[PDB]
């Protein structure tokens, strides 16, 4: 398990990879796995003017 930085809840996200995008099951926060060795979630950086498809 790990703490959501928006909500504060402890959640299970499963077998994640580094820089992977996850949705918090409680608050619906979109988050980035910024570390695995110490499992750390983080809110995404700001959208740049050339981000997308």
């Amino acid at each position: 398990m790990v703490e959501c930085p928006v909500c504060g809840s402890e959640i299970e996200i499963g077998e994640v990879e580094l820089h992977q995008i996850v949705e918090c099951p409680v608050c619906g926060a979109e988050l980035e796995v910024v570390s695995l060795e110490p499992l750390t979630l983080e809110e995404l950086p700001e959208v740049e003017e050339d981000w997308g498809e």
Partner: protein
């Protein structure tokens, strides 16, 4: 087979592509921090998934310079990802909305004389519906041009406009990979800007005409994996835009089509080329 995947963050898309790639050979996950050139890479193909369009473009070119083929190519990322270069390539081959391009505020002021009001203003390099403006009159045109002038990016000084198309509460998003149509959706919204990024709702589209037109639109480029934007109008279907770093998680869910697998299959085809 060593298949590189180049990424900023791992969205559903990238997770699914990674899965599919693993069934064909060894996958090398390449975060942007890992990208250093000239470098010593041992790769048969790289699938380019960087969230930044310009980072995608430059990393594709760099891998090409190491003799490593890229999906999509740097040439396609640039042409398809620029609204104006793409419109120029599309204009021979498929119906598109009426458009104009001007190189100064002064020249942009004459655009209504050709297109009429309302018109749509948009930056040549954006995505996700960013900086799209519906300009209903001269006062709004001036405000829009004044703001684009003050913005730092010199690209905002390339003034691209289209006639405002009256859509029926939705537009169409289709996918063609290596010349094969893989699926399409409608994107519904109460607002005229329909991207799922803000956040249009996806429904499957089985329209055979969008399939035929999407393949034609792909053929104007003649390579790669493209997400195509099409509008319905009183004059029929119009091709608006093509996107060289496709998102598809909703499109996949709603159509049941395997966009990710098709992209990877195409990548293994170019790896053997």
């Amino acid at each position: 087979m060593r298949i590189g995947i180049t990424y900023t963050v791992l969205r559903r898309e990238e997770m699914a592509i990674k899965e599919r790639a693993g069934e064909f050979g060894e996958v090398v996950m390449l975060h942007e921090d890992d990208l250093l050139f000239p470098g010593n890479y041992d790769l048969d193909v790289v699938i380019i998934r960087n969230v930044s369009h310009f980072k995608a473009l430059y990393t594709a070119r760099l891998f090409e310079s190491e003799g490593i083929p890229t999906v999509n190519s740097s040439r396609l990322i640039f042409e398809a990802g620029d609204k104006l270069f793409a419109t120029l390539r599309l204009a021979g081959k498929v119906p598109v909305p009426e458009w104009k391009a001007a190189l100064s505020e002064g020249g942009a002021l004459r655009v209504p004389d050709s297109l009429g009001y309302p018109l749509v203003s948009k930056p040549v390099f954006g995505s996700w519906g960013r900086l799209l403006a519906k300009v209903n009159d001269r006062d709004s045109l001036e405000a829009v041009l004044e703001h684009r002038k003050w913005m730092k990016n010199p690209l905002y000084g390339i003034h691209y406009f289209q006639e405002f198309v009256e859509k029926p509460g939705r537009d169409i998003r289709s996918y063609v990979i290596g010349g094969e149509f893989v699926g399409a959706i409608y994107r519904y919204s109460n607002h005229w800007i329909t991207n799922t990024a803000r956040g249009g709702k996806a429904e499957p589209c089985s329209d055979p005409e969008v399939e035929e037109l999407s393949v034609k639109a792909w053929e104007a480029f003649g390579e790669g994996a493209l997400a195509i934007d099409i509008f319905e109008s009183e004059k029929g279907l119009l091709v608006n835009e093509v996107n060289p770093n496709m998102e598809f998680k909703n499109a996949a869910r709603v159509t049941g089509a395997d966009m990710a697998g098709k992209l990877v299959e195409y990548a293994v085809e170019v790896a053997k080329t």
